[PDB]
Symmetry: C2
Subunit: 176 residues, 2 copies
Amino acid sequence: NSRQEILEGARRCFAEHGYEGATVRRLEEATGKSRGAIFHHFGDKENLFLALAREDAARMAEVVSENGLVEVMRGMLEDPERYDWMSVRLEISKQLRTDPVFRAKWIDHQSVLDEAVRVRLSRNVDKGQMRTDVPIEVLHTFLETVLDGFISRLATGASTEGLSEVLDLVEGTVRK
Amino acid sequence: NSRQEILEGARRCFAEHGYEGATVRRLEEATGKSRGAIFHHFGDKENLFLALAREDAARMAEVVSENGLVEVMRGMLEDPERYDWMSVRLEISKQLRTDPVFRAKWIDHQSVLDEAVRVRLSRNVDKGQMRTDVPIEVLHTFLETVLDGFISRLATGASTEGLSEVLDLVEGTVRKR
Ligand SMILES: [Mg+2]
Ligand SMILES: [Mg+2]
Ligand code: NA
C-alpha cells in the first residue's frame, strides 16, 4: 500500500517536474508520505525512478506477450497523457551511457521486457509467421529501434499522423 | 570564421555535458571564447543550439540528396561522434513538445533537411523505385522514426551491432517488390 502510494504519486511528480525538479519535498507533496518513508522503501531517488521503469517494463512485457512491441506502440498512440513520463525516462539517457552502475541497474530493471520480446519473437518463429530471409535478431533490433524512435518522437512533440500506418508497415516488414 | 569556431565548440560541449551541463564556463572552455563573443552572436543557449541544429540539418540534407536518410544513418554508424550532440534532444524533449515557440523554431531550423528528404523521395517515386501500395508520406514518417531511433540508441550507448543489417531491411521495406 505505502509502496504503491509512493509509486503512483512519484510517477506524477516526475512527469510534472522532470527528473531534477522532482525534489524530495515535491515527492512528499505528491505522495502524502515523508522523505523518511520514501527512502525507507526505495533507498534513494534513482532507485525510486528505477522502480517506475521496472513497472513500465512489466506492463509492456504483458502487452508484448499478447501482441508484440507493435501493440505497445499502438498503446502509446492511445495514451497522450503519458508523454510527460516518457520525457522523464529520456532524461536519464546520458547517465545510461556514462555511469556503469546505473547502466547495469537500468538493464536489470528492464529484464522482464527484454525476455518477453524474445519469447514473443520465438513463438512467432515457431508458428512460421516471421520472414526467414533475415535473421530473427536483425528483426528484433529493427523492432527495438522503431520502439525507441516512437518514444522519441512522441516525447519531443511529433504528431500522431500516419503512425498507425507506419506500425502496419513495421509489422508487415518482419512477416513472411 | 569565428562562427564556425563557436558552433564547433558548442557541438563538442553539448555532446560532452548535455544541454543543462553546457555552462558558460564550459562553453568558454570548449570555444575558448569569452562569453561575450559567444552570445553577442546568438543571444542565448537555446539559439546556439538551434544554430547548430540548422548547420547539421544542412549537412544531412546534402547526404540525403545523394543517397537518402538511410545514408545519413550509415554515416552515423561509421562515426557516431559527428552527430553525438543530437543526444541533447532526449534531454529537452518536454521543452520541445510543450513550448510552442521553441518547437516552431526547432522545426524551422530543420526545414532544409525536411525539404531534402521530400525532394529525394520524390525523385525515387519518379523513377518507380518506391513501393506504391503504401503512401509516400507513410514511408517518409517511417524513415524519420528510424532516424529518431538511431539517435536514441547511440545516445544511450547501445551497441551498433546488427544496425547496418537493420538499415538494409529499412531500405528494402520502402522499395518496390
Ligand atoms: Mg504483430
Ligand atoms: Mg537508399
Ligand atoms: Na534531396
